[PDB]
Amino acid sequence: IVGGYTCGANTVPYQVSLNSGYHFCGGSLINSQWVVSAAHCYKSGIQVRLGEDNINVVEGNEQFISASKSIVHPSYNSNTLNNDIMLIKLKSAASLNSRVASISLPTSCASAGTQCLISGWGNTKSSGTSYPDVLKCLKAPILSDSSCKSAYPGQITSNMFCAGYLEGGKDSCQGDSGGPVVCSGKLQGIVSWGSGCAQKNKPGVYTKVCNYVSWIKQTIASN
Ligand SMILES: [Ca+2]
Numbered sequence: 001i002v003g004g005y006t007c008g009a010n011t012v013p014y015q016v017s018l019n020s021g022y023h024f025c026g027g028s029l030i031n032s033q034w035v036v037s038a039a040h041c042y043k044s045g046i047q048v049r050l051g052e053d054n055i056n057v058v059e060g061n062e063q064f065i066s067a068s069k070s071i072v073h074p075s076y077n078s079n080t081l082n083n084d085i086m087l088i089k090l091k092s093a094a095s096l097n098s099r100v101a102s103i104s105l106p107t108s109c110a111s112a113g114t115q116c117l118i119s120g121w122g123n124t125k126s127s128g129t130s131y132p133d134v135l136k137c138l139k140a141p142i143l144s145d146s147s148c149k150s151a152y153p154g155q156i157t158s159n160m161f162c163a164g165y166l167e168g169g170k171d172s173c174q175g176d177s178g179g180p181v182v183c184s185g186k187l188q189g190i191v192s193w194g195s196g197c198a199q200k201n202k203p204g205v206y207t208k209v210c211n212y213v214s215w216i217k218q219t220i221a222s223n
Contacts, residue, residue, distance in 0.1 A: 001138050014182075018049075040084055071086060081160075085212050114142050117139055118204070166200065
């Protein structure tokens with residue numbers, strides 16, 4: 001996250017870190033057994049780390065649970081990043097508490113102008129590279145589809161939305177991928193892609209979670 005703020009420990013209780021020996025992507029806890037992340041984060045050998053603040057220090061609220069199964073969306077296209085969503089099942093159920101909590105799925109899509117919370121452990125610099133140990137946060141609005149499509153000609157599908165600031169300076173970044181965009185208490189986006197980070201006229205692009213609620217629910221119901 002570039003241009004954000006330190007969230008505070010366990011203030012984003014649905015945020016998970018995906019770990020394969022190191023943090024590599026975010027995700028969102030949606031029930032005691034399941035995490036939503038980006039399909040481009042897929043890899044084998046995932047450990048889900050819940051209850052994290054400093055990802056390099058054991059602080060006392062963590063739960064580390066191996067993934068038993070990951071399910072990339074049936075129509076994910078890695079070239080275009082269309083349908084950039086996956087589900088990860090935990091080998092054991094998380095113990096839910098005030099610091100480890102699921103986030104609700106949306107019932108309808110969000111609208112341009114709605115202010116959302118984006119979080120992660122990704123790069124905090126737009127030029128250069130600095131990875132934080134503690135969780136970072138950014139409040140940002142959803143942008144109109146027309147402005148999104150104008151910013152990225154030929155690239156924005158109906159399964160994507162833009163959020164952030166056209167002036168630059170405030171965005172998600174590499175290492176935030178797969179993490180949450182939460183608006184009014186609902187998971188509306190997944191950190192997906194962008195041109196660089198925090199660049200003028202190049203806002204963040206996010207997977208449009210509302211389009212996937214039926215798939216999510218039916219997948220959980222049979223897995
Ligand atoms: Ca920790």
